From a paper:
The linear ubiquitin chain assembly complex (LUBAC) participates in inflammatory and oncogenic signaling by conjugating linear ubiquitin chains to target proteins. LUBAC consists of the catalytic HOIP subunit and two accessory subunits, HOIL-1L and SHARPIN. In addition, linear ubiquitin chains linked via the N-terminal Met1 are generated by the linear ubiquitin chain assembly complex (LUBAC), which consists of the catalytic HOIP and the accessory HOIL-1L and SHARPIN subunits. Both SHARPIN and HOIL-1L interact with HOIP via their ubiquitin-like (UBL) domains, and the two interactions are thought to sufficiently stabilize LUBAC. We solved the co-crystal structure of the binding regions of the trimeric LUBAC complex and found that LUBAC-tethering motifs (LTMs) located N terminally to the UBL domains of HOIL-1L and SHARPIN heterodimerize and fold into a single globular domain.
Hence, we determined a crystal structure of mHOIP474–630 in ternary complex with mHOIL-1L1–140 and mSHARPIN163–341 at 2.4 Å resolution. As estimated via analytical size-exclusion chromatography, the core subunits assemble into a complex with 1:1:1 stoichiometry. In the ternary complex, mHOIP474–630 adopts an elongated configuration comprising seven a helices and two 310 helices and contains two UBA-like modules, the N-module (aa 474–536; UBA1) and the C-module (aa 559–617; UBA2), tandemly linked through a middle helix α4. The N-terminal μ1 helix in UBA1 and the C-terminal μ7 helix in UBA2 provide the major binding sites for the UBLs of SHARPIN and HOIL-1L, respectively; consequently, in the ternary complex, the two UBLs are independently arranged at opposite ends of the elongated mHOIP D-UBA. Furthermore, the crystal structure of the LUBAC ternary complex core has a new structural motif common to the pre-UBLs of mHOIL-1L and mSHARPIN (residues 5–45 of mHOIL-1L and 170–206 of mSHARPIN), which possess a unique helix-helix-strand structure that mediates stable heterodimerization. Intriguingly, the pair of LTMs folds into a single globular domain, referred to as the ‘‘tethering domain (TD)’’. The major heterodimeric interface in the TD is formed by the hydrophobic faces of the α1 and α2 helices from both LTMs and an intermolecular antiparallel β sheet consisting of the β1 strands (aa 41–45 of mHOIL-1L and 202–206 of mSHARPIN). In the TD, A31 of mHOIL-1L and A192 of mSHARPIN in the α2 helices make a direct van der Waals contact with each other. The TD and HOIP D-UBA undergo no significant interaction, except for a small contact site that could be attributed to crystal packing effects. Taken together, these findings suggest that tethering the UBLs of SHARPIN and HOIL-1L via their LTMs induces a more compact and rigid conformation of HOIP D-UBA than could be achieved by either UBL alone.
Numbering used by the authors:
A (entry chain B): 473 to 629
B (entry chain C): 169 to 300
C (entry chain A): 2 to 136
């Protein structure tokens, strides 16, 4: 009975997901758009409106915890989309994702003072790529020694 | 960590708010990743037979019904556990599954029940992506 | 669903607060749930599958006695040859001069990291870097 309506409602949304994918929009983009705006034309909304919303997510993130440096669009987007277009949750998670990553980089040697905030911003919140960049200076002298006179002999194991 | 977790649910099941606050705050400072689930018993009972209609980018939609697959699964199950079962039986990793139940695209973290699944025959849509 | 719905929302919000370091929100949701005497399964999420990113604590020594500890991001199902390439791409040490050891045991290009005991964050390995003059 209500089963009929659930099937209809589902199909109605699958339809827009379907249109979206063939135009390059993920299903969480289409649905996030639908939830936020109520638009009948989600593709159009994404092209024209999304960047203003992501811009807002990043500034509000910076306002809510100004200790955490500056938020990137890739981080705003990821939060917006994991919370399906709920603005206040998206802001919460954008902040939380970055807080969590600064806490990890700190425990791995790299706090705010050694450039974690700048490297997280620089790489769209990608912890793996920030860690790489932050340890470059540590490996440079190993790179620079490779051809020095008189190395120790090749160990056997 | 794992004892603080135990102590957390003991404190909440206990009615003891202050003990819940002291332990929830400590786990928070440490960024502990938790699964916090309700009791299975609180949910509408199962297993239920879910009627799944699979779809993709080019499939021709129609109000023709015909679920391709029936799955026996409990309403208390997370959407993430439906994705694991479907990866087992059929080979499609979570990365390409998108679940639609009713008006909603589903979050992995949420139960089937929370999207209204509770009876045999209930309809859900599995949308499979073609470029992960 | 009764307001079993509501109790789930709050539970899930507590998990997000805790993981996101939001101390005051963790307090709020824990407080609301404790006050409703809600029985919950609370568990630490298991350490990841072998197809998921973990942090490897690599001890590095070179052919000139120099040592340093660095942290790589690996998946345990990845091969030593894939590891070698990662370290080549990132920092320029050619695969040819990377000698990986875990145990007292020189790992081989075909062997997975998983194969060698590496499975969680914090696990260890030793990278020996050969000179270009080593014969």
């Amino acid at each position: 009975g209500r089963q009929d309506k659930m099937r209809k409602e589902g199909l109605q949304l699958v339809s827009m997901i379907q249109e979206g994918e063939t135009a390059g929009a993920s299903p969480e983009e289409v649905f996030s758009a639908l939830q936020y705006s109520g638009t009948e034309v989600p593709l159009q909304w994404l092209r024209s409106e999304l960047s203003y919303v992501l811009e807002m997510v990043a500034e509000l993130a910076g306002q809510q915890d100004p200790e955490l440096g500056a938020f990137s669009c890739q981080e705003a987007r990821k939060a917006w989309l994991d919370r399906h277009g709920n603005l206040d949750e998206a802001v919460e998670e954008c902040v939380r994702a970055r807080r969590r990553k600064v806490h990890e980089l700190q425990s791995l040697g790299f706090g705010p003072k050694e450039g974690s905030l700048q490297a997280l911003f620089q790489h769209g919140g990608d912890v793996a790529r920030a860690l790489t960049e932050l340890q470059r200076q540590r490996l440079e002298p190993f790179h620079q020694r490779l051809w020095d006179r008189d190395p120790e002999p090749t160990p056997c194991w | 960590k794992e004892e603080l977790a135990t102590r957390l649910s003991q404190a909440i099941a206990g009615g003891d708010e202050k003990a819940a606050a002291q332990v929830a705050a400590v786990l928070a400072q440490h960024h502990v990743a938790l699964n916090v689930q309700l009791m299975e018993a609180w949910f509408p009972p199962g297993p239920i037979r879910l009627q799944v209609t699979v779809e993709d980018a080019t499939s021709v939609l129609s109000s023709s019904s015909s679920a391709h697959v029936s799955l026996k699964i409990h309403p208390h199950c997370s959407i993430a556990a439906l994705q694991d079962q479907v990866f087992s039986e059929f080979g499609f990793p979570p990365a390409v599954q998108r679940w639609v139940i009713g008006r909603c695209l589903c979050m992995p973290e949420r139960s089937l029940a929370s999207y209204g699944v509770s009876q045999d025959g209930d309809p859900a849509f599995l949308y499979l992506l073609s470029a992960p | 669903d009764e307001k079993t719905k509501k109790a789930e929302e709050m539970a899930l919000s507590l998990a997000r607060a805790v993981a996101g370091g939001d101390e005051q929100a963790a307090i709020k949701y824990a407080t609301w749930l404790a006050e409703q005497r809600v029985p919950l399964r609370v568990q630490v999420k298991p350490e990841v599958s072998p197809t998921q990113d973990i942090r490897l604590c690599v001890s590095v020594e070179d052919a000139y006695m120099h040592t340093v500890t660095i942290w790589l991001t690996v998946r345990p199902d990845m091969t030593v040859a894939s590891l070698k390439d990662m370290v080549f791409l990132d920092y320029g040490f050619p695969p040819s001069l990377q000698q990986w050891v875990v145990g007292q045991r020189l790992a081989r290009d075909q062997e997975t990291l998983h194969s060698h005991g590496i499975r969680r964050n914090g696990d260890g390995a030793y990278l020996y870097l050969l000179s270009a003059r080593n014969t």
